[PDB]
Design a protein around this ligand. Structure first.
Ligand SMILES: Nc1ncnc2c1ncn2[C@@H]1O[C@H](COP(=O)(O)OP(=O)(O)O)[C@@H](O)[C@H]1O
Ligand SMILES: [Mg+2]
Length: 337
């Protein structure tokens, strides 16, 4: 009869109680939304907070609406996600239920990828790079735990070495942020696999190391506006035991999703995001793009997980961008079903 509506509802319930242990089931895909709090500006123009997250996996959007006759009312729309962080959640907290549970996956010899997605000024970079910033952001934290996991009994007889790469994608091709924005070439041989020629891998033996690389890169990404907010940032943690690659973790700081003549470039951002969504969806089982081309191998393997973190500015003034972001997340999530 209406099984299609039934399934989507069941789905909504299954996710609505949410046992954070969601564990050794098989969860290749993780979707989490995160409301930031209102900043100073927004508070000064006395902007309205239209987001509420009453439970750990239920976000509500109090979108404002006018009746044809000008009457005011609210369309309290409710969404659900594996995990729903409020404005009080610190990075570490967010990091714990998102990026953390994936580290192990690179050690088990898998490939992981965590994505920061949302409108511009929502939080993506503040979450990935750090609130100067680094060391508090997910790149750092994730690094920290990669070492703590390497000198581990179980992972000691592995003899692995830790490597890190930092690059940005902006309108076609790649630019290494660790080799002075040196533009790089992307090739695809005659079987499925892509390769970014010239990407610089830096050996790291300490969290303080990876934090140096992070500052350097972020330094060559925000100095020279609002471009950073129009490029894809991608930090990689790689594990080699000499020979091939053991495991790989791709942390990606996406460009505004809310994105004339040259501004038409937003079409490249939108193709990528549409590409991403389909690759991710392919995982739980389409007009290529640079981004999804570079991270191709991290979606095709069977031993590969990924966590999407949808950032959200709570201001009423961003309501329509919020809804956009949520909607996009919704489709990413119901990929596990
Ligand atoms: N949870 C948070 N706690 C404190 N400051 C935050 C938080 N999230 C975002 N911010 C602040 O908000 C701004 C927007 O984030 P970034 O600047 O992360 O934007 P975007 O989502 O465009 O990458 C930054 O000034 C950052 O310091
Ligand atoms: Mg940003």
């Amino acid at each position: 009869p209406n099984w299609e509506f039934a399934r989507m509802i069941k789905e909504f319930r299954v996710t609505m109680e949410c046992s954070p242990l969601t564990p050794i089931e098989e969860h290749r895909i993780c979707v989490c939304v995160r409301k930031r709090p209102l900043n100073k500006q927004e508070l000064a123009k006395k902007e309205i907070d239209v987001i509420s997250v009453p439970s750990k996996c239920l976000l509500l959007v109090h979108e404002p609406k006018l009746k044809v006759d000008l009457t005011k009312y609210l369309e309290n729309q409710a969404f659900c996600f594996d995990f729903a962080f409020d404005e009080t959640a610190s990075n570490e907290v967010v990091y714990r239920f998102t990026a953390r549970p994936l580290v192990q996956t690179i050690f088990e010899g898998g490939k992981a990828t965590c994505f920061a997605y949302g409108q511009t000024g929502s939080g993506k970079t503040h979450t990935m790079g750090g609130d100067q910033n680094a060391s508090k952001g997910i790149y750092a934290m994730a690094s920290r735990d990669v070492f703590l996991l390497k000198n581990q009994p179980r992972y000691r007889n592995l003899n692995l070495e830790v490597y890190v790469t930092f690059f940005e994608i902006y309108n076609g091709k790649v630019f290494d942020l660790l080799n002075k924005k040196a533009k790089l070439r992307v090739l695809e041989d005659s079987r499925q696999q892509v390769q970014v020629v010239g990407l610089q891998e830096y050996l790291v033996t300490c969290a303080d190391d990876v934090i140096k690389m992070i500052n350097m890169g972020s330094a060559c990404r925000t100095s020279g506006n609002s471009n950073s907010s129009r490029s894809h940032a991608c930090f990689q943690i790689l594990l080699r035991t000499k020979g091939r690659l053991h495991g790989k973790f791709s942390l990606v700081d996406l460009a505004g999703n809310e994105r004339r003549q040259t501004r038409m470039e937003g079409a490249e951002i939108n193709k990528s995001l549409l590409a991403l969504k389909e690759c991710i969806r392919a995982l739980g089982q389409f007009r290529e793009s640079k981004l999804t081309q570079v991270l191709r191998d991290s979606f095709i393997g069977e031993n590969s997980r990924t966590c999407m973190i949808a950032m959200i500015s709570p201001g009423i003034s961003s309501c329509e961008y919020t809804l956009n972001t949520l909607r996009y997340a919704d489709r990413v999530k119901e990929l596990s079903h």
